[model samples]
Target: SFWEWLNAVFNKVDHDRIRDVGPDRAASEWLLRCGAMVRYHGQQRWQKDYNHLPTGPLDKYKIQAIDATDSCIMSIGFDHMEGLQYVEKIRLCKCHYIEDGCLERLSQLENLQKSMLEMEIISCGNVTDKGIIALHHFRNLKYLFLSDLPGVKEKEKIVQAFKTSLPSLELKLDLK
Candidate 1:
């Protein structure tokens, strides 16, 4: 049944026409909609590359999906997510994947920073203190989530770190 579902969904025509939404993307979306976290075990690149120089018409709607719910995802590329500024209730999924040390682009999301309500990052091995610190730019953030992080192991350490980094912001780890 799973295999049949996979073939049916994955083989369908690409609605976004981005060519990268193969079986992996299909399966990831499936799990997300099924009330489960979308974990990409394979190192497949994201479908779009928004950060590349001179993005054409497609750049406007690069990260177009905002209806995601109960989803926990970790994507490895930052090619086109620069325009994913409208996603605010993304509580379950927080990604720390980056390429070429180019994380500064994520820090530049002024609009997203202002609107984002809940945030989380889990098990991303590449994230550093600087990337976490960059979130301080978000003044309206209410809930922050981090679990099984690579470097910061203890809860106290994580709390202290965020306190020192973003003193004015309120954060919750949601460990229970």
Candidate 2:
């Protein structure tokens, strides 16, 4: 039941909560509450603490980037990303819960596909070739970094798949 609680916390999306504070705020709530970090546009600092986040100026804070390093974010609450329109960079460093299906789910989010330019995934062991290939849906992605993923096989196929999908792609990886 312990792990189940973690799953619930990660997947649960509070729709009523979004109507109160808005999507960016609700998304931030989920991200910070689950140990991930968010950076709003024009801010130099990353919002890392869940208890104390700025909700000021009576203006919506546009989340521009996220770092889900070592967090419990899986594929479930990705709906949080649906409302984001300015996020361009997301890094998944040591995010044990990240898997290929997560990427598949994420790529389908039109908001992200429209705004995203770069992404980095490292040390996530559940990602494999099919999951990575599904990311070909990213029509404008420029940079992608994948490293230390022992679960990925035929790295060449995955890399080349993006080559055709993202003509201006800059890929970096460390499969060894």
Local accuracy of candidate 2 as per-residue lDDT tens digits, 16-100: 8877888888889898887899999999999999888886854368899999988888877787888778989998888787777
**Residues 11-128 of candidate 1: C-alpha lDDT, one tens digit per residue:** 3334363344433343334433333332222223332221221233322322212222332222322223333445453433333323114335545667566666656655455555
Give the count of colliding residue pairs in each prediction: 3, 0
Where does model 1 exceed 4 Å of error? 1-79, 91-103, 153-161, 164-168, 174-176
Q: Positional deviation of 5 in candidate 2, in angstroms?
A: 2.4
Displacement of residue 53 (Cα, Å) in model 1 is 26
Query: Local distance difference test, per candidate?
Result: 0.44, 0.84
